[PDB]
Structure 1
Amino acid sequence: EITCQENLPFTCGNTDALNSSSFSSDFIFGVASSAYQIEGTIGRGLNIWDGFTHRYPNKSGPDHGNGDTTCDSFSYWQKDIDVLDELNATGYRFSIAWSRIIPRGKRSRGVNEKGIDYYHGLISGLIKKGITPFVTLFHWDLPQTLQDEYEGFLDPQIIDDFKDYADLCFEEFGDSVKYWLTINQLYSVPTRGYGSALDAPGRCSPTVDPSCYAGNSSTEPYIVAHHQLLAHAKVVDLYRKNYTHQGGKIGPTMITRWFLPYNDTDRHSIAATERMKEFFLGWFMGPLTNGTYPQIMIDTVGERLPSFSPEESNLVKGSYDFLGLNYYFTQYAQPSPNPVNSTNHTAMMDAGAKLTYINASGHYIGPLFEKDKADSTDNIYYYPKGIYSVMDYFKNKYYNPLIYVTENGISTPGDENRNQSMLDYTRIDYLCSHLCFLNKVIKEKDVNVKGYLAWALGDNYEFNKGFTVRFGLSYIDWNNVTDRDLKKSGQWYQTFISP
């Protein structure tokens, strides 16, 4: 019987008590990264995140940093590969920058050969080292040209361009890549990119944010989420129909959170937690497992929620071979009003829930996750048992899918110096306690989890944060980005994989 601690101090950092041998022998352990965060702009066209970080530098981070050079993996990808090889990792998830291989967006405008070569070299190098690539087709870095031609995912013309892009990738890399993540965290772009304008492209209602160049926080997230689903379903249908000879699997990446009631005996708090589960997860998981949106969403959102045609509904339903789950933390939910007529209404208010990390009797959900310096009542706290609850939920509610944990990690302040940043014990506690609950759920609930990829390989540009927080397991000196040095967390992870 497996016992896991939910509060500090954790003792699972000991690999005599927990290591890769606690899991099935085929279990994949690795790390993850994304193109915009690690590559640099060298050699590629521009994408909406280059646009956003430049047009609105105070949304790029408090240091106004961006992905211009970041850790320069365009030059030093071979160092990324030596860190993995040093961990004896069997999995690496990275993303192909659409901008690098089709700079002008539409495929008929020509492909960038030098870009295609960059990824062949990378894939060849990983596989030579016995590392399985999980490649994300789209990690938020849409070619700027498509956002300016028709406002990206706001328009249905994105579906065919995305499909021609994906086709180019399966054809070029599919012989070696056997695992494809179509779109990374479905929930993010529509809410942050089109609801609150905290992420690219930064659209939202004028009174939600007056910096926004355009938008409607009330209608656009629903129009964007819809197209993301059709786009995704159309790539999966292209994959399973035209590239089945490649013997790969392809699936979506869902940002998952667990929700607990703020007051676990107030029915209003209980209804708000069930509504969160539906607006956060079901919004995407419902179309993917059933071809339609959740009923609470259809009731609440009404005309602002697009309908799937019977053909579209059939294409989206069951459009995955597995699910990639990104899990970071859990929130307490309590009711909150949905003012549909206010000019500052957003799609996120439609859930009628307010989210916190402290419940009604003042209990904090777990240890600290991310210190907010501007406001401390905004601090984020994590909850190791959340990975247990989310996985058990997905098994029971969504037909026992094959699952890969594609991102799980914790940042530490960039303020810290080199000695302090290399001694990241708070990261060992985060990862070890989630790994202890992940092993327990695989064993007790028989969830079909087949892999785990820690975020991130090394320090890189963090969306909305610049270089002010660090997520890597290996250290990078911003004044000289050549070396990736294993921090304590990286040395711990190494001993975990090979005990």
Structure 2
Amino acid sequence: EITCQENLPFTCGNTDALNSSSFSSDFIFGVASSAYQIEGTIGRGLNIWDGFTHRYPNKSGPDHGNGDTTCDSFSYWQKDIDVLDELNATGYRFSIAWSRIIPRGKRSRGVNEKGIDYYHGLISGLIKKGITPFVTLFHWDLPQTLQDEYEGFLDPQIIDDFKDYADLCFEEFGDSVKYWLTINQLYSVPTRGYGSALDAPGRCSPTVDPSCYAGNSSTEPYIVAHHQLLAHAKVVDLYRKNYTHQGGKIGPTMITRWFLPYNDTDRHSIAATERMKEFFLGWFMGPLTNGTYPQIMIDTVGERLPSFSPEESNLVKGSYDFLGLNYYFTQYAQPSPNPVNSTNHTAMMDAGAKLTYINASGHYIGPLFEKDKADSTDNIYYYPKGIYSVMDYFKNKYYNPLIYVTENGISTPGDENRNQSMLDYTRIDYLCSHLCFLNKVIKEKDVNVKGYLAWALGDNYEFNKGFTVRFGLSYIDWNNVTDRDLKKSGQWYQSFISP
């Protein structure tokens, strides 16, 4: 019988108690990263994250930091492989920058051979060290030209352009890459990029944020989500029909969260909690497992929710060999009004729920995850059991899928000096507490999880936060980004992997 801790202090950092041997022999352990966050603009075209961070510096981060140079993995990709080698990692998730291999967006306009070579070298180097690549085709960095031509994912033209880009990737790298991720965190771009405008492209309704250049927070998130599903499905169909000879697997990446009732004895809070599961997870998992959106969304969103044609529904349903599940935290849910007529209405309000990290009785869900200096009441707290609950939910609600945890990590303040940043015991606690519960859910619920990739191989540009927070298991000096030194967490993970 496995027992896991939910509150501080944690003792899972002791590799004698918890290590890789606790998992199945073939279980993959590694770290993850994304192109915009680690490469730099050198050698590639411009994408919407370059556009967004430059047009709206205040939105790029409190420090106005962006991905211009960041950790310079373009030049130091070998250093990334060295970190993985040091960790004895068996997996590494990275993304291909669409702007690096097809700077002009549309494949017919030509490809960047040097960009293709960049990834060939990285992939070859990973395989030579016994590291299995998990490659994300689209980690939000859409070529700026496509956003300017037809507003990217807001238009159906994105489907064919994304398909042509994915085809190039399968053609060029598919002989070595056997695990593909289509779109990173399906829920994110529609809501943050077209709803709240916290992320690129930065579209929203005029009254939601006057800085948005255009948009409609009430309708656009649904249009974008719909196109993401169609684009994703078209790519999976292409992969399974034209690249089955490569013997690989492909799937979408879902940002997952668990939800608990703000008040567990209040039917309204309980209902809000179930609505959240449908609006947050079901929005994409419904189409992916059934070819239709959840009924609660159909009823609530009405005319603003696009419909799938029979052909599209068939294309989207079952469009995955596995699911890349990102998990960070859990929230309490309570009812909230949905003012559809208000000029400031957003798609996110449709769930009819308010989210918090503190319940009705004043209980904080778990240890501190992220401290918000602007407002103490806006701090994020984590919940280790959430990963158990999410995995259990996916197995029982979504037809026992093959799962790879594609992201799981925690940040530490950017204000900390080198020594403080290196002594990241809070990261060891976060990672081990989640790994404990992951091992527990695999054994108790028989969830088909076959890999775990911790977020951020090293410190990089963090979307919306610039360099004010660090997520890496390896430290990076911004005055000399060459080195990738394992922090205490990286050293612990090394021991966890090879006890």
Q: Give me the TM-score of the superposition, normalised by structure 1.
A: 1.00
Query: In structure 2, what is the equivalent of residue 421 of structure 1?
Result: 421
Q: CA deviation at 1:262?
A: 0.2
Instruction: State the alpha-carbon separation in 1 of the partners of residues 143 and 219 from structure 2.
Output: 23
What SS does the aligned partner of 1:354 have? Answer: strand
Instruction: State the alpha-carbon separation in 2 of the partners of residues 433 and 216 from structure 1.
Output: 40
Q: CA deviation at 1:190?
A: 0.1
What SS does the aligned partner of 1:191 have? Answer: helix
Instruction: State the alpha-carbon separation in 2 of the partners of residues 2 and 125 from structure 1.
Output: 38
Instruction: Spell out the pairing of 1:421-460 with structure 2 (5 A cutoff).
Output: 421-460=421-460
Query: In structure 1, what is the equivalent of residue 277 of structure 2?
Result: 277
What SS does the aligned partner of 1:436 have? Answer: helix
Instruction: State the alpha-carbon separation in 1 of the partners of residues 446 and 341 from structure 2.
Output: 46
Q: CA deviation at 1:204?
A: 0.2
Instruction: State the alpha-carbon separation in 2 of the partners of residues 4 and 104 from structure 1.
Output: 50
Q: CA deviation at 1:117?
A: 0.3
Query: What is the CA deviation profile of residues 273-315 of structure 1, one whole-angstrom value per residue up to 9, with x for unaligned ones?
Result: 0000000000000000000000000000000000000000000
Q: CA deviation at 1:197?
A: 0.4
Structure 1 portions without partners, runs of 5+: none
Query: What is the CA deviation profile of residues 145-168 of structure 1, one whole-angstrom value per residue up to 9, with x for unaligned ones?
Result: 000000000000000000000000
Instruction: State the alpha-carbon separation in 1 of the partners of residues 301 and 475 from structure 2.
Output: 45
Q: CA deviation at 1:343?
A: 0.2
Instruction: State the alpha-carbon separation in 1 of the partners of residues 230 and 76 from structure 2.
Output: 36
What SS does the aligned partner of 2:462 have? Answer: coil
Q: CA deviation at 1:141?
A: 0.2
Query: What is the CA deviation profile of residues 376-416 of structure 1, one whole-angstrom value per residue up to 9, with x for unaligned ones?
Result: 10000000000000000000000000000000000000100
Q: CA deviation at 1:255?
A: 0.2
Instruction: State the alpha-carbon separation in 1 of the partners of residues 121 and 390 from structure 2.
Output: 37
Structure 2 portions without partners, runs of 5+: none
> Which of structure 1's runs of 4+ aligned residues deviate more than 4 A?
none
What SS does the aligned partner of 2:452 have? Answer: strand
Instruction: State the alpha-carbon separation in 1 of the partners of residues 29 and 309 from structure 2.
Output: 40
Query: In structure 2, what is the equivalent of residue 203 of structure 1?
Result: 203
Instruction: State the alpha-carbon separation in 2 of the partners of residues 455 and 222 from structure 1.
Output: 28
What SS does the aligned partner of 2:492 have? Answer: helix
Query: What is the CA deviation profile of residues 64-108 of structure 1, one whole-angstrom value per residue up to 9, with x for unaligned ones?
Result: 000000000000000000000000000000000000000000000
Query: In structure 1, what is the equivalent of residue 182 of structure 2?
Result: 182
Q: CA deviation at 1:322?
A: 0.2
Q: CA deviation at 1:61?
A: 0.2
Instruction: State the alpha-carbon separation in 2 of the partners of residues 291 and 463 from structure 1.
Output: 31
Instruction: State the alpha-carbon separation in 1 of the partners of residues 156 and 487 from structure 2.
Output: 45
Instruction: State the alpha-carbon separation in 1 of the partners of residues 283 and 213 from structure 2.
Output: 27
What SS does the aligned partner of 1:372 have? Answer: coil
Q: CA deviation at 1:3?
A: 0.2
Aligned alpha-carbon RMSD (Å) = 0.3
What SS does the aligned partner of 1:211 have? Answer: coil
Q: Give me the TM-score of the superposition, normalised by structure 2.
A: 1.00
Instruction: State the alpha-carbon separation in 1 of the partners of residues 498 and 172 from structure 2.
Output: 33
What SS does the aligned partner of 1:94 have? Answer: strand
Query: What is the CA deviation profile of residues 233-266 of structure 1, one whole-angstrom value per residue up to 9, with x for unaligned ones?
Result: 0000000000000000000000000000000000
What SS does the aligned partner of 1:49 have? Answer: helix
Q: CA deviation at 1:199?
A: 0.2
Query: In structure 1, what is the equivalent of residue 32 of structure 2?
Result: 32
Q: CA deviation at 1:323?
A: 0.1
Q: CA deviation at 1:321?
A: 0.1
Instruction: Spell out the pairing of 1:54-133 with structure 2 (5 A cutoff).
Output: 54-133=54-133
Instruction: State the alpha-carbon separation in 2 of the partners of residues 391 and 414 from structure 1.
Output: 32
Query: In structure 1, what is the equivalent of residue 139 of structure 2?
Result: 139
User: How high is the sequence identity, in percent, across the aligned residues?
Assistant: 100
What SS does the aligned partner of 1:464 have? Answer: coil
Query: In structure 2, what is the equivalent of residue 490 of structure 1?
Result: 490
What SS does the aligned partner of 2:217 have? Answer: coil
Instruction: State the alpha-carbon separation in 2 of the partners of residues 172 and 5 from structure 1.
Output: 45
Q: CA deviation at 1:4?
A: 0.4
Q: CA deviation at 1:34?
A: 0.2
What SS does the aligned partner of 1:428 have? Answer: helix
Q: CA deviation at 1:361?
A: 0.2
Aligned length: 499
Q: CA deviation at 1:22?
A: 0.2
Q: CA deviation at 1:192?
A: 0.3
Instruction: State the alpha-carbon separation in 1 of the partners of residues 269 and 353 from structure 2.
Output: 8
Instruction: State the alpha-carbon separation in 1 of the partners of residues 108 and 440 from structure 2.
Output: 50
Instruction: State the alpha-carbon separation in 2 of the partners of residues 332 and 99 from structure 1.
Output: 39
Instruction: State the alpha-carbon separation in 1 of the partners of residues 12 and 344 from structure 2.
Output: 46
Instruction: State the alpha-carbon separation in 1 of the partners of residues 402 and 83 from structure 2.
Output: 28
Q: CA deviation at 1:446?
A: 0.4
Instruction: State the alpha-carbon separation in 1 of the partners of residues 219 and 29 from structure 2.
Output: 40
